[PDB]
Amino acid sequence: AVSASSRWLEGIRKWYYNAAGFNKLGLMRDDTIHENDDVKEAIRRLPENLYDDRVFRIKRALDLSMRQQILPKEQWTKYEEDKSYLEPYLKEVIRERKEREEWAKK
Amino acid sequence: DEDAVPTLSPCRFTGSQICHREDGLPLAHVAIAVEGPGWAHPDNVALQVANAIIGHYDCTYGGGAHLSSPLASIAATNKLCQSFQTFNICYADTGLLGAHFVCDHMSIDDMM
Amino acid sequence: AEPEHDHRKRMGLKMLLMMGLLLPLVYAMKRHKWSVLKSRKLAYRPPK
Numbered sequence: 001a002v003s004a005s006s007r008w009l010e011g012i013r014k015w016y017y018n019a020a021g022f023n024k025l026g027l028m029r030d031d032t033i034h035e036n037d038d039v040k041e042a043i044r045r046l047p048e049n050l051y052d053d054r055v056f057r058i059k060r061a062l063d064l065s066m067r068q069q070i071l072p073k074e075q076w077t078k079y080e081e082d083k084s085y086l087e088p089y090l091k092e093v094i095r096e097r098k099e100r101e102e103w104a105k106k
Numbered sequence: 107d108e109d110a111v112p113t114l115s116p117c118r119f120t121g122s123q124i125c126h127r128e129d130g131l132p133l134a135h136v137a138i139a140v141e142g143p144g145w146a147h148p149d150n151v152a153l154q155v156a157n158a159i160i161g162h163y164d165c166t167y168g169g170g171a172h173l174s175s176p177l178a179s180i181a182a183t184n185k186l187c188q189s190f191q192t193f194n195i196c197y198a199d200t201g202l203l204g205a206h207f208v209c210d211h212m213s214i215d216d217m218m
Numbered sequence: 219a220e221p222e223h224d225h226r227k228r229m230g231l232k233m234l235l236m237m238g239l240l241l242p243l244v245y246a247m248k249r250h251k252w253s254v255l256k257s258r259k260l261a262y263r264p265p266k
Contacts, residue, residue, distance in 0.1 A: 049264070056262040067256060 014079045023077040024070040025061040030054075030086035038097065042089040050085050117200050133188060133208055136217070142194055142201020150194065153203060157192035160205070164189045186213050 017023065022032050031054060033039055046054065064070060119141040143149065161175035163182065170182035181187035190207035209217050220226075 052264055056260075060260060060262075063258070063260060 017079045017082075022061075023079075023082075025064050026057060026071050026075060026077060027061050028057065028077055028085070029082055030084060031057050031061070033086065033090075038090060038093050039086075041093045042086050045089045045093070046086070054085075114198050117197070119200060134211060134214055135206070135208055136214060137204070137206040138218075139193070139195075139202040139204035142196060142203035144199040144201065145196045146199075150196065153194055157194055157203075160192050162189075162191045163187055181217070184216070186217050190217070 022029070035043070043051070043054070142153070159175065160177050161173075163173070163175070163178040165188050167173070167178075167182070169178075171179060173179045173182060177190065181190065186209060188208045188210075190205060192205050193202065195202040207217050
């Protein structure tokens, strides 16, 4: 259904994504997340392929940050191509903690 | 016999490091070498004398503590090692002179 | 007010001349050691 308002909402989201600039280092959104306990558990649950891809992406970014350089524009992560690979692991970890917290109430 | 031969061009040695990090693998392999001279060179003999002093080791040798080589003795006593070997690989006018070893992840720094 | 004025400035010249030597040289020392890192190449080689 939804057309004109949605693309503008997406436009501000896409604008901010580019201004954030983790994509200039080849980072995905989920690579940049602060490692709390919920997050560390989500990393631990990642499958082999995704875990190893995550590390290479961090390494390549820390390497760039040391040299104070960025990737060629060709190689920046496109907002449309940004895979929220951690989110469903993290969501489930949060859901598990919240159930424990409800049981601890009663 | 006939035209177009090459003789061997000399091969530049570079002080350098390659690090294939693979944590899935149960033991680390490290090889380290300086530039040897060639096949031809008289001081290959004295380098080999020296390499024999450092020697080789393996976890299936008799003699932990009592082995003559201080590398072999300490590697056995302190469990630093599954194996090491000295080498002097020779090519025309260049070589690889040093040592290879195989060890646990927590033992590389001590072995070096 | 300031008997040290003349000594202060002679020392001052001696400082700037020394710092003009020592700052580029210590910089060159830090650049030497850091070279190993600043020119490092990474490759990712996963199975399949």
